[PDB]
Each structure stands twice: as C-alpha cells, then as structure tokens.
Amino acid sequence: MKQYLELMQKVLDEGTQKNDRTGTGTLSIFGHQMRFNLQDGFPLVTTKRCHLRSIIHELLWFLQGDTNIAYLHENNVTIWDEWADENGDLGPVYGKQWRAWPTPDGRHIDQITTVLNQLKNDPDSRRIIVSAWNVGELDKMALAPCHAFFQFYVADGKLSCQLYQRSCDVFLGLPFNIASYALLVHMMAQQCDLEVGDFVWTGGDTHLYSNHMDQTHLQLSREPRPLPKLIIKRKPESIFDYRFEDFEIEGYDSHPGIKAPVAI
C-alpha cells in the first residue's frame, strides 16, 4: 500500500545502522505515524501476497483471553510456536491483559468489555484504551508486548483506533499487524452500529533487517493495487462470539509472495 511502501523507503533513506538483540543488524528510525481510512478499503498489503487465515484466528484467540496456543494449534496456526513452552503456555501475554489484567487487590480487569461499555455509553471519552503493557507481568511473558497500547475514538458516526507499536519489523511483521487491527476496528464498529473510520499506526523503533534488503527493493519496485473489501457475513451478539467463517475478503489482487528469512 502507498503508506506502507513510503515507510519502507523512509527506513532506507533515513534509517541508521545498528543491531537487534544481538544477531542480524538493522536500519531503523524512531517515531513514525501513518493513517488508513478504512472507508477506502481493507488495508491488506498487495505488493506481496498476504493471507488473513492466521490473522483472524490470532485475533479471535486474543479476544477469548486464553494464552495457551491449543486453539491456534487445532487450527494449524503456528506463529506463536516459537515462544510457547512444553505445555503450550506463553504466560500472560496479550489476551490475558486484554481480558483479565490482574490488579493488586485480586481482581481481573476486562479491558475489552470496558471499552465496549464506553463506546456505548460515553463515546466521547478521551480514555477508551486497552493496554497490554502490564509492567508487573512482563517477566512472566514469553514475549514483551509489541503492539503495546491502543485507543479508540468516535466522530461523525465513525470509529477510529490508534495503535502504539513499540518495535516493528517493517518487512515481516507490519503487514500482519496493520490487517489485524483493521479487522478489530471493523468488528468493534459492527457491534456498536458505527461506520469504520481511520486506523492510525504509530511506531517506536521501526526497522528493516539487513537480510531483508533485497526483498524490500523488490517490493518497492511493485505498484500497489486496489485495496480489497472486508465482508462480515454475520452480526454476532457480542465481540466474543465471532467465528472464523464470518470473515471474507473480496477483490484482493496481489503481487507474488516474498519469503522473509530469519536468523536464529
């Protein structure tokens, strides 16, 4: 997409050379923001072939709050295998914080329900927020949250959302990340009888790995194509009742896929 390709080019032109947690070096910039008007189409990268299968399953999994990869496993979703232990546990990552943030007085806070409560009764609130950055549980997580915090906003009958991504692998992770949150906005908007607004992506340490340079140049040589249209075949009773089959993508015309090799 135009915004995505412009970001790739920016990292190439302005990024500084350094390293990741000891391993492959990177070109990185700090602080970036881009906006996707969801009314112009579902933001699924077209300059390389992308799939929504893993994205959908992972989001439904987040919304359920269970941080065991069992569900992902039964559906052949392997993106979290790398971090799961023998029992398939990941610790209190995303889902746990979204649905049951532990408080020091013994309670578990359901931030998703809290947000839906706010959108319904106080849509002009300036604190419709969900945070996965639970400082007190970071050490127990298999992975410190990458998409750390997001906020919703309502205006002119449209629902918008801004995500703060503390660290981002522009080539491998970003396409997945953008589509995941765009999907969530569509679901939230459907439950609140609102139209979709903008998805605002804000990043911290935004980088390109040195071994992805040829892949990036190849993708930058491709012209982006008409964004597809997200179709939600059903209208569930709540945000927790969506099913994989409820989502469909129409008019998705993409360029060939590009593999993303990683060092170990």
UniProtKB/Swiss-Prot annotation:
GO molecular function, one term: RNA binding
Free-text function comment from the UniProt entry: Catalyzes the reductive methylation of 2'-deoxyuridine-5'-monophosphate (dUMP) to 2'-deoxythymidine-5'-monophosphate (dTMP) while utilizing 5,10-methylenetetrahydrofolate (mTHF) as the methyl donor and reductant in the reaction, yielding dihydrofolate (DHF) as a by-product. This enzymatic reaction provides an intracellular de novo source of dTMP, an essential precursor for DNA biosynthesis. This protein also binds to its mRNA thus repressing its own translation.
GO CC terms: cytosol
Gene3D superfamilies: Thymidylate synthase/dCMP hydroxymethylase domain
Enzyme Commission (EC) number: 2.1.1.45
Gene: thyA
Active site: C146 (nucleophile)
Residue positions binding (6R)-5,10-methylene-5,6,7,8-tetrahydrofolate: H51, D169, A263
Subcellular location: Cytoplasm
Entry comment on modification after translation: Although not discussed in the published references, Met-1 is represented in the submitted PDB entries as being modified by either a formyl, or a carboxyl group. The N-terminal is probably N-(dihydroxymethyl)methionine, the hydrated form of N-formylmethionine.
Source organism: Escherichia coli (strain K12)
A single GO BP: methylation
Quaternary data: Homodimer.
The protein, known as: Thymidylate synthase
Record has Zinc as a keyword: no
